[PDB]
């Protein structure tokens, strides 16, 4: 019984070079754009953190892989986009191009999400429909036997509920009774519930300028990708901003479809990604009231909006004091960090998000039908009277508030 | 054994010889009306489609099939007449003059909207009734074994509920586990179910000259068709409408049955086409109101309308505003697009058509009972009061306004 272990190895070779394993929705399914992992995200650079966990050593994929050790933990950037890089490593097996991978027998790529029943049960309905020949158990004393020739590539650990497959939880924090490598994906937040088993840990970085030009370039229309391009040589803010995967992805959505190119002000694109991160989570925001929702997310408006003036960016817990923030953490317009930290820090998604949000928040108090509301926003804005405050620290929250309604220009622009 | 599989792939052949195969209704079988095949529509033209959803490399039949890939996606134009498409493909193969089909042992014809209780059961009832010399389940075996060998065209997509036969949904996404051939065909409307498992995709293109005068000239009598043919060659105006098949058969099934030639203005053929759409849909417009039907039926009215004036033939979901807009969906005059775009968006299914469906909401106003009505007719017959828009802009609309009532005629020639 070893020819259908080889006929496995070359199935699932073959089996990640299939349009439905390299086909994604960089928005999520809600929104119908999809993008073919061959070129796309393919230059990936990686952050190795050390014991104060803090970065040192830029690595890249096909330089990490010829140091693995026993399970590796790889971090989103902050839950931004999706972590398409577990599948990048199955396909560069599947092609057989990477020699730091030509030593594995077996490469399993799951989508832990959707594991229940135990780890064969997964392996046979996600994956490869496995063969009766050896579809008896006794696959799993080929593996122990095997040893480390095979990688189980664990996606969407945050969704992972361990009730469901026990035996893979196990896989993961129990890796000495099973003798294999594992490489796991997971998110700030639910970091905590692992980190203390892995062997190396690593952060997905940002995008390098070539990257970001490459990826706009092949999935848009040359017309507009000129026209992006061009826009982006020439202002001084968005090459800095096109570093964030999600911003250089929403540039092009929300050009697509269009015969013609549009400037689309930094305004509209942070506005565009606030509504992306407030509905896609909405989902899960059915556990409390409407009512709720909404003070929380004003609750977080008015934070960012006091955190501009007193140039506050690291929040603690008695700064939000609401136990209902597990929606805004949900949301995702916070970020919990727990480090090496005996206090728990938040912080915004990016100090140009907060400014955004503030702006939002002041543009609608000042628009208020309710005096006491326009009271409010009156009162911030009346701080602007200093030249040294108005082309500076407040040249951020001054734009966005303007351009995020017409009424709210009006009384900036009557103050200034 | 193998006697077995020769005569089922002989059978076949012969099958799709059978005048119960090739005799199709154009219109639906609600109309008593029966073309063959082998002599109509046989000469269409695709399109591929690239990454950005645009159409490259105008492909004909007997080409594409030259470069068939793993599971291929056609979409048909828009939701006109029966796709009659991946019938020929099982005729060239069952004649056997097509070389691209020549590797293949076996094809299978499937109208997937009458697919329930398996594959196997499938093929053998709906089909050749397998004998029961091999009709064991080792027929499957037979296939995986075979491999690419056959052709699985599966009809009629997006009737499909999958819950009935999760078989032959696994055999159209999950390709790699069948390792075989599957060609399917789809709606605009259904497409974002699928595509991202799609190896390639092609639309269905509109008719050529040559193709639309032979099949004129082939299904109707010598008399009429040759007054048809005059006709259309003497105004500016039909050669350019006879390229959507639509208004190719109507306009002979309308002249079926005659013994003289009759002109039948455009008005009437787009009358006969808008009758159509809400009567070939009524079957599935049992789950709204009567009057709800028509108060979304008169929405879309004022939306053309109003098109036509602020020449806006592109409109999003908030020029809508109506949960209830899934019966004009249903209905089919309007088409909801989804592509590579942020946002949905839907169409008119021609501009033509947009431009007669103003017109008749036009005119149904200006002879309502109810002054109101009239008033809202006479608001919009007020603006004609510009040349350079009477024979224009509006031309389109007034002559369809006119030539739908002899009392909306009479309010126009009046203002005019």
Request: hydrophobic share 40%.
């Amino acid at each position: 019984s070893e020819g259908d272990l080889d006929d496995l190895a070359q199935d699932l070779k073959d089996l990640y070079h299939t349009p439905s394993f390299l086909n994604f929705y960089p928005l999520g399914e809600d929104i119908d754009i999809i993008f073919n992992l061959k070129s796309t995200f393919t230059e990936p650079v990686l952050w190795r953190k050390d014991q104060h966990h803090h970065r040192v050593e830029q690595l890249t994929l096909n330089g990490l892989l010829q140091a693995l050790q026993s399970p590796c933990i790889i971090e989103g950037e902050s839950g931004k986009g999706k972590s398409t890089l577990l599948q990048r490593i199955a396909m560069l097996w599947g092609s057989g191009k990477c020699k730091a991978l030509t030593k594995f027998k077996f490469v399993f790529f799951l989508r832990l999400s959707r594991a229940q029943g135990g780890l064969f049960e997964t392996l046979c309905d996600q994956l490869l429909d496995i063969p009766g020949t050896i579809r008896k158990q006794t696959f799993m004393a080929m593996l122990l036997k095997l040893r480390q020739r095979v990688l189980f590539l664990l996606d969407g650990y945050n969704e992972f509920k361990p009730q469901n497959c026990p035996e893979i939880e196990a896989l993961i924090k129990e890796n000495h009774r099973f003798k294999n490598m594992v490489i796991v994906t997971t998110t700030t937040e639910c970091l905590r519930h692992i980190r203390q088993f892995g062997a190396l840990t690593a952060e997905v970085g940002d995008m390098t300028e070539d990257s970001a030009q490459a990826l706009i370039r092949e999935v848009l229309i040359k017309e507009l990708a000129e026209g992006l391009l061009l826009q982006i040589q020439k202002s001084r803010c968005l090459r800095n901003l096109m570093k964030t995967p999600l911003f250089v992805v929403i540039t092009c959505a929300i050009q697509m479809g269009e015969s013609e190119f549009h400037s689309h002000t930094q305004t509209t694109l942070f506005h565009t990604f606030y509504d992306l991160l407030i509905q896609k989570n909405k989902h899960k925001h059915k556990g409390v009231a409407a009512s709720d929702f909404i003070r929380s997310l004003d609750h977080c408006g008015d934070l960012a909006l006091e955190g501009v003036f007193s140039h506050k960016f690291d929040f603690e817990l008695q700064d939000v004091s609401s136990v209902n923030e597990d929606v805004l953490l949900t949301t995702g317009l916070l970020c919990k960090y727990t480090a090496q930290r005996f206090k728990p820090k938040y912080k915004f998604f990016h100090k140009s998000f907060q400014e955004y949000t503030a702006g939002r928040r002041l543009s609608s108090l000042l628009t208020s039908h309710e005096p006491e509301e326009v009271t409010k926003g009156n009162g911030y804005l009346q701080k602007m009277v200093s030249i040294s405050d108005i082309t500076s620290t407040y040249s951020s929250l001054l734009r966005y508030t303007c351009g995020s309604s017409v009424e709210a220009t009006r009384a900036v622009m009557k103050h200034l």
